[PDB]
């Protein structure tokens, strides 16, 4: 949800936060039985009964509304 | 005399009561051990039920 309220550049932050959640699940799984992390993630991402998740759909949304119209490529720095 | 027979009678009593307590002890520690085992079985079964619900949903369409 935090990703969905921000531009495309925030996807790196999302990835870090997802990784902390993965570590959290791992630490908790030593003592508790939880649904698999992938299952948890796919559900939250609405990617269980749908082919493209929320992250994929927000990326295209931001490409269409922010990246394509507002960004300037610098070929020397990539 | 009757006191010597009383000593034998109460020793016998002591042996039976001791054995009853041993049965009770076993019954309590058997209950506790099975409580753990049933909890473990429920834990695994609940997880397996959840996983199936999930896998099924990956292969089935949602409700309109
Ligand atoms: Cl964040």
């Amino acid at each position: 949800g935090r990703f969905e309220s921000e531009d495309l550049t925030s996807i790196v932050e999302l990835d870090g936060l997802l990784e902390i959640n993965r570590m959290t699940h791992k630490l908790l799984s030593r003592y508790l039985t939880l649904d698999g992390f992938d299952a948890m993630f796919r559900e939250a991402n609405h990617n269980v009964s749908a082919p493209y998740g929320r992250i994929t759909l927000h990326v295209f949304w931001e490409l269409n509304y922010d990246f394509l119209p507002n960004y300037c490529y610098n070929g020397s720095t990539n | 005399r009757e006191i010597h027979q009383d000593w034998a009678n109460r020793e016998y009593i002591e042996i039976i009561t001791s054995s009853i307590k041993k049965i009770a002890d076993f019954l309590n520690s058997f209950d506790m051990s099975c409580r753990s085992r049933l909890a473990t079985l429920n834990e695994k079964l609940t997880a397996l039920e959840r996983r199936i619900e999930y896998i099924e949903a990956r292969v089935t369409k949602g409700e309109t």
Side-chain angles (χ1 to χ4, degrees):
Chain A
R2 209 159 178 91
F3 182 48
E4 290 170 328
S5 69
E6 298 229 58
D7 61 42
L8 190 58
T9 67
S10 75
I11 200 166
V12 175
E13 203 162 342
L14 168 67
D15 186 77
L17 189 46
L18 291 181
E19 206 57 39
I20 285 161
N21 280 290
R22 192 191 293 273
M23 185 57 180
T24 307
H25 161 105
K26 182 197 280 294
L27 296 172
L28 291 160
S29 289
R30 293 176 300 175
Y31 312 107
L32 309 175
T33 299
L34 300 160
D35 302 350
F37 185 77
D38 189 41
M40 281 187 177
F41 173 77
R42 283 188 195 271
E43 183 182 337
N45 202 31
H46 293 193
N47 190 34
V48 171
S49 58
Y52 318 106
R54 293 162 64 185
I55 292 163
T56 297
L57 298 163
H58 186 58
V59 160
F60 179 72
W61 183 270
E62 289 301 305
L63 287 175
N64 191 268
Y65 283 109
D66 191 41
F67 184 79
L68 297 193
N70 300 314
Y71 280 79
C72 310
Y73 188 57
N74 187 324
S76 298
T77 62
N78 192 30
Chain B
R1 51 171 288 100
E2 284 162 332
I3 48 148
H4 170 100
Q5 193 57 52
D6 190 51
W7 278 109
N9 284 332
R10 292 195 282 99
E11 165 145 299
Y12 174 84
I13 284 167
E14 222 61 51
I15 291 156
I16 308 282
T17 55
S18 200
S19 296
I20 285 173
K21 224 154 280 173
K22 284 188 178 181
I23 298 174
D25 286 340
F26 164 84
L27 215 50
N28 291 348
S29 61
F30 181 88
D31 187 44
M32 298 318 290
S33 180
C34 288
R35 294 291 172 172
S36 269
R37 293 199 63 185
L38 284 161
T40 300
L41 292 173
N42 196 13
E43 183 183 10
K44 190 165 170 171
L45 178 53
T46 307
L48 266 35
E49 287 172 323
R50 288 178 67 90
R51 190 135 85 106
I52 281 298
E53 193 93 296
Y54 160 73
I55 299 166
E56 278 193 295
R58 293 193 76 186
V59 180
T60 312
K61 300 149 282 177
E63 284 192 319
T64 51

